[PDB]
């Protein structure tokens, strides 16, 4: 017979109008699943190439080595009903990293005309429904990946450490291999006597940077975004740098924009600067 799993995903993008994405550029949403597949949506604000449209796609992000699926995209209005729906006429074949969708989902001009009301408060709300079909001829619970947490313990308990990092007097124990694998700046030092001096980062900010290096996370980033941005920059931890940019971006206010702009120039935080420049003009 058949097993058919149906699920939904809602995606709201604020200040859609101000999305400076140019033709070809993409915005990726968060992942979602039916509830062992992991999906997500990709949108091209100015077409994939016909740039007078929005390109919308459904991407299979992760899965255990193929999946058939029918999909339907639409836009929700203020009352929460669908409008402008496009649906696949059949189920398409997906594999990890594969996507399917509509190059010409909807015309910008139409989406931007306030007469149609698809952007209440300038917020675009995309809705996606998926239907996965499988032949009978999922039942095994597999634990989530715990790589980050186990490597995190390596730093939190100083197990099998091999080098010492002296931060403004304080001695911290770490693993060279891990630091080098994760930092080009650190990799450069260990490529040219197991004791490294650091005087550009404050201890507290250091512990958090290290937490990122060992686990890809930084739980306390919010209370030290500016200092972490600078620390991330000096040690070429590009992703962490961007995470701090996002934290600073959502703090922009008339009172702090100028300061945040200066900060972004000094640490070559391209996304933060643009956002700051834009924030300041809209308030000139």
């Amino acid at each position: 017979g058949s097993k058919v799993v149906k699920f939904s995903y809602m995606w709201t993008i604020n200040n859609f109008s101000f999305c400076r994405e140019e033709m070809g550029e993409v915005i990726k949403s968060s992942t979602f699943s039916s509830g062992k597949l992991k999906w997500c949506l990709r949108v091209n604000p100015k077409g994939l190439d016909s740039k007078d449209y929005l390109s919308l796609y459904l991407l299979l992000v992760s899965c255990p080595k193929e999946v058939r699926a029918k999909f339907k995209f639409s836009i929700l209005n203020a009352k929460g009903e669908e409008t402008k729906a496009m649906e696949s006429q059949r189920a398409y074949r997906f594999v990890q990293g594969k996507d399917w969708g509509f190059k010409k989902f909807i015309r910008r001009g139409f989406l931007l005309d306030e007469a149609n009301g698809l952007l209440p408060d300038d917020k675009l709300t995309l809705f996606c429904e998926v239907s996965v079909v499988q032949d009978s001829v999922n039942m095994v619970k597999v634990p989530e990946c715990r790589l980050a947490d186990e490597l995190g313990g390596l730093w939190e308990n100083s197990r099998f450490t091999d080098c010492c990092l002296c931060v403004a007097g304080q001695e911290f124990q770490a693993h060279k291999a891990i630091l080098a694998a994760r930092s080009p700046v650190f990799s450069a030092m260990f490529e040219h006597k197991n004791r490294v001096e650091i005087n550009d980062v404050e201890p507290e900010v250091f512990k958090e940077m290290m937490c990122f290096i060992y686990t890809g996370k930084a739980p306390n980033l919010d209370k030290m975004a500016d200092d972490l941005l600078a620390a991330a920059d000096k040690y070429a931890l590009e992703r962490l740098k961007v995470m701090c940019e996002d934290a600073l971006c959502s703090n922009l206010s008339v009172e702090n924009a100028a300061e945040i702009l200066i900060l972004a120039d000094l640490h070559s935080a391209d996304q933060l600067k643009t956002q700051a420049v834009d924030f300041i003009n809209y308030h000139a």
Binding site: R42, L48, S55, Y57, S88, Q89, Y92, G97, K98, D99, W100, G101, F102, K103, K104
Partner: peptide, 6 residues
């Protein structure tokens, strides 16, 4: 009309 960027 369904298509894939990949």
């Amino acid at each position: 009309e369904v298509t894939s960027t990949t």
